């Protein structure tokens, strides 16, 4: 039952991540972090695929779709602002989500 268990999570994950994406929408400070491949060929953007699926993409005939992340629930995370070596230390506050994007065929 290899493909079975995974597609069951892919369905769910492509939903749950959409909610917490729109659950934090307005002004209050909430942050998420991304992981993307290098060299950054060029942009296109994310959106719900037809029939409730989820598909990211870039422009100029390329399709890159990936979602989900490894297990959370430990990390207490906030990024800080550092500039010029002069004192800055600016806290934008907290963090929310984690997501990775794998390319595909």
């Amino acid at each position: 039952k290899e493909a079975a268990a995974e597609l069951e999570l892919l369905n769910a994950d492509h939903q749950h991540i959409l909610r917490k994406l729109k659950k934090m929408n307005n002004k209050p400070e909430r942050f998420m972090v991304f992981q993307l491949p290098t060299r950054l060929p060029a942009v296109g953007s994310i959106r719900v695929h037809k029939s409730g699926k989820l598909s990211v993409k870039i422009g100029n005939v390329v399709m890159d779709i990936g979602k989900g992340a490894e297990t959370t629930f430990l990390q207490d995370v906030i990024a800080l602002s550092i500039a010029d070596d002069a004192s800055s230390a600016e806290l934008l506050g907290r963090v929310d989500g984690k997501i990775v994007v794998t390319p595909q065929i």
């Binding site: 994406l21 729109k22 934090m24 929408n25 002004k27 400070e29 909430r30 942050f31 998420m32 972090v33 991304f34 992981q35 993307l36 491949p37 290098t38 942009v43 953007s45 994310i46 959106r47 719900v48 037809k50 629930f73 430990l74 990390q75 207490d76 995370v77 906030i78 990024a79 800080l80 602002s81 550092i82 500039a83 010029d84 070596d85 004192s87 800055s88 230390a89 600016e90 806290l91 934008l92 506050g93 907290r94």
Partner: protein
């Protein structure tokens, strides 16, 4: 069906991200606990950031042991090692569109004490060839003194990157 737009922001001083494995989830309404008082020390690359957090006298302080050995009574000390890996961005949602600001370097936070190394010494007390490990040590202890004042407020953090579109 619809479209979710996303953007890629500019340089903007880049960023540095905190994480620490000490505090767990409180399972309550607000899970996170906010660290305070700042007081960080800094240096050039591979900077070994230092984190300082206050100590309360109200709950289980055990004063008799303090006066005996370490007089500290004061703000807790945490340090950590920074690391960098390419292809990592941060995201925040504004209105119906998505905006994205690159993170750059990352650091881990786990503590240690100068109430130790100083106490171990006072207890005990009474050239061309090198590279790698100790070169990151001998130079380390020498070159690090910086006083960073952490002040938290936000207005232009958006509009700076927003107008770049």
């Amino acid at each position: 069906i619809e479209e979710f737009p996303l953007k890629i922001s500019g340089e903007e001083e880049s960023l540095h991200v905190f994480q620490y494995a000490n505090r767990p989830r409180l399972v309550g309404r607000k899970p996170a606990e906010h660290p305070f008082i700042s007081a960080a020390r800094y240096k050039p690359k591979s900077h070994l950031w230092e984190i300082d957090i206050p100590l309360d006298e109200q709950a289980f302080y055990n004063k008799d042991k303090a006066e005996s050995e370490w007089n500290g009574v004061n703000v807790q000390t945490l340090k950590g090692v920074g690391v960098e890996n390419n292809g990592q961005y941060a995201a925040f949602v504004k209105d119906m569109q998505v905006y994205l600001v690159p993170i750059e370097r990352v650091a881990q936070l786990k503590p240690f004490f100068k109430y130790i190394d100083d106490a171990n010494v006072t207890r005990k007390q009474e050239q061309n060839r090198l590279t790698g490990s100790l070169l990151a040590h001998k130079v380390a202890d020498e070159e690090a003194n910086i006083e960073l004042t952490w002040a938290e407020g936000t207005f232009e953090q958006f509009k700076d990157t927003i107008v770049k579109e």
